[PDB]
Amino acid sequence: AKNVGILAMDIYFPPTCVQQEALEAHDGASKGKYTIGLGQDCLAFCTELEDVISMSFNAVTSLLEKYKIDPKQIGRLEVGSETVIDKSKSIKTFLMQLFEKCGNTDVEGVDSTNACYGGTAALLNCVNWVESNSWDGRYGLVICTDSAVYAEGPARPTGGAAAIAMLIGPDAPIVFESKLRGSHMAHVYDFYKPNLASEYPVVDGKLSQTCYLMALDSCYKHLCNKFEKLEGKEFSINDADYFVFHSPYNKLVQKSFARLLYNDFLRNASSIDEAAKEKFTPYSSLSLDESYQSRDLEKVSQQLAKTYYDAKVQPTTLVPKQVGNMYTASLYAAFASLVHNKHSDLAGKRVVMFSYGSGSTATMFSLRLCENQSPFSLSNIASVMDVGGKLKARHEYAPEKFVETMKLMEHRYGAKEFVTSKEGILDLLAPGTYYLKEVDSLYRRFYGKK
Amino acid sequence: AKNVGILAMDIYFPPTCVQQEALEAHDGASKGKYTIGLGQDCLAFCTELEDVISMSFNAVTSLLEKYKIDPKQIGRLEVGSETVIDKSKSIKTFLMQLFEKCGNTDVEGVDSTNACYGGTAALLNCVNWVESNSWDGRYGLVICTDSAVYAEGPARPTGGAAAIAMLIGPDAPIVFESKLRGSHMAHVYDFYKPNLASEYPVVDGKLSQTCYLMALDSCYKHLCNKFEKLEGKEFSINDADYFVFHSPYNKLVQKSFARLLYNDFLRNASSIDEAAKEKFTPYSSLSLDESYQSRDLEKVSQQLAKTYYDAKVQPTTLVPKQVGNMYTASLYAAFASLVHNKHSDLAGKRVVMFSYGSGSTATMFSLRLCENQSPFSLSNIASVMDVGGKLKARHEYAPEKFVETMKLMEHRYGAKEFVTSKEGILDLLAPGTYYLKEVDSLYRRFYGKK
Ligand SMILES: *C(=O)([O-])[C][C@]([C])([O])[C]C(=O)S[C][C][N]C(=O)[C][C][N]C(=O)[C]([O])C([C])([C])[C]OP(=O)([O-])OP(=O)([O-])O[C][C]1O[C](N2[C]=NC3=C2N=[C]N=C3[N])[C]([O])[C]1OP(=O)([O-])[O-]
Ligand SMILES: *C(=O)([O-])[C][C@]([C])([O])[C]C(=O)S[C][C][N]C(=O)[C][C][N]C(=O)[C]([O])C([C])([C])[C]OP(=O)([O-])OP(=O)([O-])O[C][C]1O[C](N2[C]=NC3=C2N=[C]N=C3[N])[C]([O])[C]1OP(=O)([O-])[O-]
């Protein structure tokens, strides 16, 4: 099975959102804090009609239709998420609804979890399945779905919500460079959900950044070690056209690439010139526990990194910045907007992907995109995904009406025996969206279309 | 990568248990109900010192040691479970504790969930990984871990609890027959956990059996279809030496094999002789919704099946029957006791495995066991696992002291900021068991050894 990777792709996010500027005011934050501080524009959220299942039906239904895939042609379907509706019954069984008709029940895969990382877990699982002795010739399908949703304090501005669907197969326009990757996994308490009854994480936002970069440095090192063996050269930031990142908010996207850049210094690689070596040089004598904790250094990193970041990272940022944290689908929404923006420069280019999940589980990995044939083309994908279309059909909510909706979702999380209030909302959704109709007294869930 | 499957194996279950006969009395059930009705002998349970993490450290630690595996040699580690302690932070990160020292952080995999099925999900994931272009030459390690635990009514007698660890690699004494398998997945509400705050499932025990067999008939059909292509013959119960099953209680183990037998009739295969065709014959005119719902038919099925079941299924039953439902580790505990019992007849034999998970996700799949070389031998495995040893070092609890412990675990499930009460318990565990020391106010968990 040759050149396996992603053949086709679709996305779905709720059209309902709150402008970040409008919110800053609501919260009594300052002029800059969300639009400059977090570097976010607009935050999308599930109201009472939407959840990780419905978002899922949306992105799956939309992919099969638009790339014209026969649902008989699917032989593995996995889901990555961290939003839990049931502790035992996976989202992947809910989705089996759509194959209940095509008569196609012989489909491997369940859900993969660990925090922003499950989607990646699944992706790899599907690639590996296509490449294995048990591959039956049919497609893989991976769904990354999540609703990111936080309690009052300073983490609420970073929610977001979306599903992504990826079809996996041989002869892909987006080809995995199988051996060029680095993971880092560890036992760690930076962000987690111990509180079974609430949607809300316990987040230690200091640790939450120090561990993200701890993991990014180790992934990058492990990827560099592989690259030496493969290609005979030391890896620099110069060796990839684009870096794509898990994007919980744009600020941290910028510090991440700028950290790659700093890693290059430490290794004294190709992309570090003489002027940089001096700028960086005062910081040589710091411990790592110092390199992570140190603001002067972030400051200096970003400045050297500025112009490269504009070349290599900037075009991955459209969707995250206009939607918010999409947890497992974040990376792949960043990758999507990259395809939206530079689908024409892309043939022959190398995309480096960094997946992070708190707790922690992480993997950087590499893709070679290429000249391929529709339906499964860089152009057809960008076209099919209609990211400009979708951004255009959004519906704003005054911060108020959003705070309200938040309090409502909090009452619905975990609960039973409520029909959902339709009016003012149903007609905000595109004809053919799936939506929650009710939850019976046995917590069973019912969806309608349209 | 040749002949990939399971190279080595270990198990762990809590030594603490309640005799099923002793319990029947407690509950005011009748003479037969648990020992004959469910066909269970003895039920193992986690007390306050044990959980799915500690059980996990136990089976992992024990495997690495006893098969003498260097923890640097592990390159993928996945966990299958359905017991949730944290909604986002996977058990697989807790286990990363043990590689925090060997310095080995570059390990793929997270948790797979769907009900009794996650372990199988993981197993396949690891096989597929060894077989993929991204395989780095190191071992797979799969952990199946669960604590099965039910509220008062007639499902409490069917709890159980255990971890299993399986090392995955080429040149295995237990070889996957890659193409000989059948899955069945569906959206269904037979058993699930909607109640985020309780350990207890919502179970619809009628549906729970009708769906199990619905899935078993479809898996078996899909496996038969494959076998025709492969070997040129129609599959009968005669075509495998042993059938191994998810074993939530032995009764349903017997109806499962006997159903395979009935499936053979329907297909009119090799293993159905003339006398059987008549016995079966009144039931020809039933709908499936009749074949599932019909007691006369179970009755007739088991009777034909009796002697074969004693040959092909009976020796897989030791551990399940003396431990109880082990959820994702159940199948593999049944497989383990099969290796314990018939490790000498096993070279050259075919084992057929049926994995089920409610909600529902299911897969039958096949193994060819073989003549191999220690450490990774059928004899060394049976030896290492010491199933007779372990059954001997169990500690009984009067039904009382068990009901008490249950009420205690209910208070601890989901909670924070309690040190665990040691005395009367610590000394019941084998020197070197991991155990919960405390849970702080930030729900973080602390384990000691021994
Ligand atoms: C996964 O596996 O599923 C889990 C995750 C969540 O997916 C894993 C991740 O991706 S981790 C990414 C990091 N964490 C999160 O996304 C967690 C959720 N969010 C938060 O905890 C908060 O939003 C954090 C802590 C990240 C930020 O909020 P604050 O507490 O407000 O931040 P603070 O530390 O005070 O600094 C904020 C930032 O903004 C700047 N700033 C403040 N005021 C400003 C301003 N900029 C411009 N104008 C104004 N008025 C401040 O200087 C700082 O930014 P810098 O860029 O460092 O200068
Ligand atoms: C996974 O994905 O993680 C989820 C699972 C749980 O792993 C998926 C499964 O493996 S499903 C397997 C089936 N379900 C379960 O394990 C769920 C938990 N248990 C239960 O729901 C109950 O224990 C059930 C319903 C299975 C049985 O309990 P009862 O309600 O007591 O059963 P009932 O329907 O009344 O019939 C019981 C059985 O026992 C016989 N019997 C009754 N009294 C007897 C007696 N036999 C002998 N002596 C006495 N006194 C009765 O006739 C029947 O047995 P038969 O063999 O049919 O005759």
Task: Tell me if A442 sits within 8 A of B202, measured CB to CB.
Answer: yes
Query: Which pairs count as long-range contacts for B32-38, CB under 8 Å and 24+ apart, including other chains?
Result: B33/B157, B34/B157, B37/B251, B38/B157, B38/B158, B38/B249, B38/B250, B38/B251
Residue A173 phi, psi dihedral angles, 5° rounding: -70, -15
Distance, C-alpha B131 to centroid of its chain? 24
What one-character DSSP code corresponds to residue A430? P
- 3-class SS string, A59-95: HHHHHHHHCCCCHHHEEEEEEECCCCCCCCCCHHHHH
Which residue type occupies A187? H
Q: Which burial class, exposed, middle or buried, applies to B450 when counting CB atoms under 10 A from its CB (0-12, 13-18, 19+)?
A: exposed
Please tell me if the CB atom of residue B158 comes closer than 6 angstroms to any atom of ligand 2: yes
Residues of chain A with C-beta less than 8 angstroms from the C-beta of B415: none
If we measure between CA atoms, which residue out of B94, B98, B93, B124 comes closest to residue B110?
B93
- B335 CA distance to ligand 2 middle (Å): 22
Apex CA A135: angle with CA A132 and CA A139, to 5°?
A: 120
- Contact B114/A at CB under 8 A: yes
> What amino acid is encoded at B22 in this protein?
A
The amino acid at residue A340 is H
| Cβ contact B66:B448 at 8 Å | no
Distance CA B139, CA B69 (A): 9
Helix axes B20-27, B399-412, angle to 10 degrees: 80
Show the domains of chain B with their CATH numbers. Answer: 1-450 (3.40.47.10)
In DSSP terms, B23 is beta-bridged to: none
Q: In this structure, what token pair is assigned to residue B300?
A: 């007739």
The C-alpha atoms of residue A237 and residue A245 are separated, in whole angstroms, by: 14
List A1's β-bridge partners, or say none.
Answer: none
Q: Residue A399 corresponds to which tokens in the numbers above?
A: 């911060």
Residue with token string 């043939």: A347
Return the ligand 1 atom nearest residue A358 CA: 2
Instruction: Give Dmax (Cα) for chain B.
Output: 69
Indicate which technique resolved this structure. X-ray
**Helix, strand, or coil (residue B403):** helix
Q: How far apart are CA B414 and CA B208, in angstroms?
A: 26
Alpha-carbon gap, residue B190 to B222, rounded angstroms: 22
Q: How far is CA A49 from CA A302, A418, A435, B252, in A?
A: 41, 12, 5, 40
- From the list A7, A63, A72, the residue with the least C-alpha distance to A374 is A7
Distance CA B135, CA B139 (A): 9
Helix (H, G, I), strand (E, B) or coil at A414: coil
Edge to edge, the sheet with strand A395-396 lists A42-44, A16-19, A395-396
Instruction: Judge: B87–A193 Cβ closer than 8 Å, yes or no.
Output: yes
Q: E strand or H helix at B139, and its extent?
A: strand B139-148
Closest among A450, A411, A416 to A47, alpha carbons compared: A411
The token pair at A200 is 């809300």
Does the CB atom of residue B56 touch ligand 2 within 6 A? no
Query: DSSP characters for A210-277?
Result: HHHHHHHHHHHHHHHHHHHHHHSS---GGG-SEEEE--SSHHHHHHHHHHHHHHHHHTT-TT--HHHH
Using an 8 Å CB-CB cutoff, list chain B residues near A115: 88-90
Resolution in A: 2.5
Residue A153 CB less than 6 A away from ligand 1: no
For residue A267, the tally of other CB atoms under 10 A from its CB is: 16
Dist. CA A396–CA A400, nearest whole Å: 11
**Closest C-alpha among A316, A348, A321, A309 to residue A332:** A316
CA distance A165 to A151: 28
Distance CA A125, CA B389 (A): 37
Beta pairing class for B16-19 and B395-396: parallel
**Angle at alpha carbon of residue A420, lines to A416 and A421, rounded to 5°:** 145
Determine whether the annotation assigns residue B116 to a binding site.
yes
Q: Which of A189, A332, A358 to mutate to test the pocket of ligand 1 (most atoms within 8 A of CB)?
A: A358
Q: Which of B420, B133, B316 is nearest to A170 (CA)?
A: B133
Atom of ligand 1 nearest to the CA of A330: 7
Taking contacts as CB-CB distances below 8 angstroms, the residues of chain A near B178 are 132-134
Min distance B333 CA to chain A CA atoms (Å) = 20
Please report, to the nearest 10 degrees, the dihedral formed by the alpha carbons of residues B17, B19, B20, B24 taken in order: -110
Residues A150-167: b if buried by 16+ CB within 10 A, e if exposed: beeeebbbbbbbbbbbbb
Note whether B339 contacts A: Cβ–Cβ < 8 A: no
List B residues 185-244 in contact with A (Cβ-Cβ < 8 A): 185-189, 191-197, 201-202, 218, 222
Can you point out the beta strands (E) in B260-414? 350-357, 361-369, 395-396
Q: Nearest CB to B93: which of A100, A124, A361?
A: A361
What's chain B's length in residues?
450
Start-to-end C-alpha separation, chain B: 39
Position A422, amino acid: K
The whole-angstrom separation of Cα A74 and Cα A129 is 12
Residue identifier of the C-alpha nearest atom 1 of ligand 2: B116
